Design a protein around this nucleic acid. Sequence first.
RNA 1: UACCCGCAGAAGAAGCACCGGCUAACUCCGUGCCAGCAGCCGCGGUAAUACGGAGGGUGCAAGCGUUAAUCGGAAUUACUGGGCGUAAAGCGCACGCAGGCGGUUUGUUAAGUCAGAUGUGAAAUCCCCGGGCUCAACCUGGGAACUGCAUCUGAUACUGG
RNA 2: UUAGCUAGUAGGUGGGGUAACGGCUCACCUAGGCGACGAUCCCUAGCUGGUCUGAGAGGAUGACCAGCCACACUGGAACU
Lengths: 205, 80, 82, 129, 156, 87
Amino acid sequence: ARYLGPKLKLSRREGTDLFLKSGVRAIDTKCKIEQAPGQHGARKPRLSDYGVQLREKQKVRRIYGVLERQFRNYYKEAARLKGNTGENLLALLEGRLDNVVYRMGFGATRAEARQLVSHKAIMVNGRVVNIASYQVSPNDVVSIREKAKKQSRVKAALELAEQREKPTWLEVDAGKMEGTFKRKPERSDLSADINEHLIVELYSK
Amino acid sequence: KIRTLQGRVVSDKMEKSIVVAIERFVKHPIYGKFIKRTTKLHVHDENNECGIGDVVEIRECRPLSKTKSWTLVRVVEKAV
Amino acid sequence: MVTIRLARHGAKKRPFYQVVVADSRNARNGRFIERVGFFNPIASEKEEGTRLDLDRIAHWVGQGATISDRVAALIKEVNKAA
Amino acid sequence: SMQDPIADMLTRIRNGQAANKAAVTMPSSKLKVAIANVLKEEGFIEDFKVEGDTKPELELTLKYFQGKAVVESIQRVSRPGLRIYKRKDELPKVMAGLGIAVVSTSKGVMTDRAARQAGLGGEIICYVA
Amino acid sequence: ELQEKLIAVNRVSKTVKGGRIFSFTALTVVGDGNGRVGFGYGKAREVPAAIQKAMEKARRNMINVALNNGTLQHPVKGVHTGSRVFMQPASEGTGIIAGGAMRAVLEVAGVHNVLAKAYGSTNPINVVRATIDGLENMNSPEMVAAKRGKSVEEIL
Amino acid sequence: ATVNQLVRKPRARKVAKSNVPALEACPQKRGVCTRVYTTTPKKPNSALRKVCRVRLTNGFEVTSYIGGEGHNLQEHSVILIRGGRVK
RNA sequence: UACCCGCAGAAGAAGCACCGGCUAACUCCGUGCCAGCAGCCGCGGUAAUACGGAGGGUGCAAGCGUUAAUCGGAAUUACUGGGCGUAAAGCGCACGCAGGCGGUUUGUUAAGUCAGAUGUGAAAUCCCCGGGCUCAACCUGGGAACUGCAUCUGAUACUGG
RNA sequence: UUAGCUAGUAGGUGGGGUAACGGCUCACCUAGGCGACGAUCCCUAGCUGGUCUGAGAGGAUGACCAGCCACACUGGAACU
Ligand SMILES: [Mg+2]
């Protein structure tokens, strides 16, 4: 129930950055960033209205690695809630446990953040949480437990967090390798390449 | 005070029994039109005293007959 | 006749009981009479485990109700704790 | 023939707007005045002039704005073949409340937003927008 | 800043003694994201050529539409040539709910959260003419305050 | 469309039937092969469509298209049909 | 049993469907109205993006497809929310009962109608706010709701009497 | 393209009967009773909370949980 294929092949499909590797080696030095994979990947078609709504939703899933049914459950939850549904939807996406570990930069990629939660190396409010898709409540702490603090892939990811923009809604520590979920973020606190007014309409035919 | 009803004296031929029809005036559950709907009842009169074509006032009583569980209380405007 | 017994309402291996006024000839899925409270044997900490209207119960024993074994135990032990 | 004076009235209002007339007259009724004394108050006509002794005749003054009309819509909700009785909660909002709905309740004739503040429903006559 | 969307690519024909002269036709709409929008139906002998005539029609002859913040102000319906189309404001954060040409014409109209439904003919020429007519006569609370000689709070 | 006519007579919503009645609202039904043969189709296409006349469970005698290319079908053989018309 | 530590290696653990348009995703080769394909329009009559194979790609996922079965889309029975000059559709007209419908004005009545209040509308379910299981599914607390009906107190504009 | 249906039927009086009221049963009177607001007859069917769909209106639906009902080889009958 995971994607296991080539990561940058998905980047070549959507054509934009998906942050799927550590960014140490330059991304364009690993793939033609503006050719879709395979034979007929150079020629850009007159892409239709249906496709760009699909490609937008296929972007956001492949941003966070979320399969369709479980992603649809987020849509059902966000539609049940109040206000802007896409802002509610992104909050659910930011509510993911394996997201915040990448947002705290403890794992270099989200999949490198996910394996840690899979291999039980995390403590949330002092409690180990095996589920990567767990929804993070506000004002909680996410601490590396002391079995796998000594992994070299932890502290090298901390430097990659220094390379990235530091998020705002995360009171993150370094010496204890812990953090604190301050508050929920905004639409504005995330990127602008994700349209609110498309992923709603795709699931509202 | 009592749960009483009125209606139209339809038949008075059979002895100690009159047939009274009652208009219930009800909305249609879909179309919303108010319909005159008719509920007839066999009412035990005494005395066979009711004129045909009359407004009576009735009351629910204990079961008088096989088809009759209704007894009048009084009569308004007996004439034709 | 009128009973007050324990009614399994929960998942497998984790029981939860609606201790209600019911009938001693009816069943657990089926007919109760009045819902007078609940009980969790897996009542953890920081949560109540037995919230019963202990005065309408006295109304029905006044009408001659029948009280089960744990129900007689737990109404005592609530009053032996509250 | 004559199945309603009210539906006669609203259509005579409706056809007078497009005819760009300044005065629409008709025989008057007690219910007609009770409606015509709302739309002046609600600002959809300018003047009504009830006159007539043997038979009262209501004469209206149509309100025109920037050349064109004011009455953008005028309808009938409770028709004589199908009556409408809605409670205080099911009172509508004509043009999202920008227009008005004429309701007659036991407290005479008023608008719906007054009837909500009156807190009592009744018979919805027409929609004016 | 006037964003532009083509609507229809289409191939009609005249018939002569020699045969059939195919001609490509195109429907477009422009709009600024504010309450200014204009459609354009162009026609030429060529697909990238008739669209420019369709745009040039649409760049002229605009219409001024009283929007609300991100939506309509009150629901209204729209008709042109058997193409009865109802539309409706919605709550914030729900997107445009419409199909066909109506998705395009509201997006260049700069609304963001609507409800809409087409009845009858879904012919994209006359279905967008019905959208415009409903958006055209949709009026402000401020205007009907001035039309009725009142204020906003004298309406609420 | 007058509501008095609507009162005296309700709107008769039209009742639709199945085009595949022999299954009698089942997903698949067992059948027995009666005759296996070919059939020329109608005008726009020209082929020999392999097809079998089938005795069913409920005694119905129907025809059902053999999909694919090539088969090992005999008469007096137990088969299973899913539906779908051939145009 | 729940849960807790050791152990060992990337180890033992991914597949269906699809690419003519409809609808996201194409080339090559076989094939020649044959073999076939097919939800619809429709493809194959030697150069097939529609057949078959390959490559590549799209969609999902421990499942993926097909069939069955119900609503939706379908306003395609149109209460909400249709039409009848010629696209289906106004009886060949007239009469007329039941029927439905009713000018104006005053009182009366309070039936309808509206308002209020009691009773009931079991629980479950759904909704809302919570809680509990590592989360989720699930369980569960409280609430709202159960659009009603009965009764009582009004109300009097309209519709009735 | 089911229009007439009913003789204990319908009512009364009296007697009997049942825990209970009542053609419940019987006797004797009366001729009534029902139906075009669908009686009658035919076809199909356990019913509701609910479930599924639908924006709603509605539509379909009654496995699982409930509430009720009916049945227990078939047809019968009482017994306790
Ligand atoms: Mg929202």
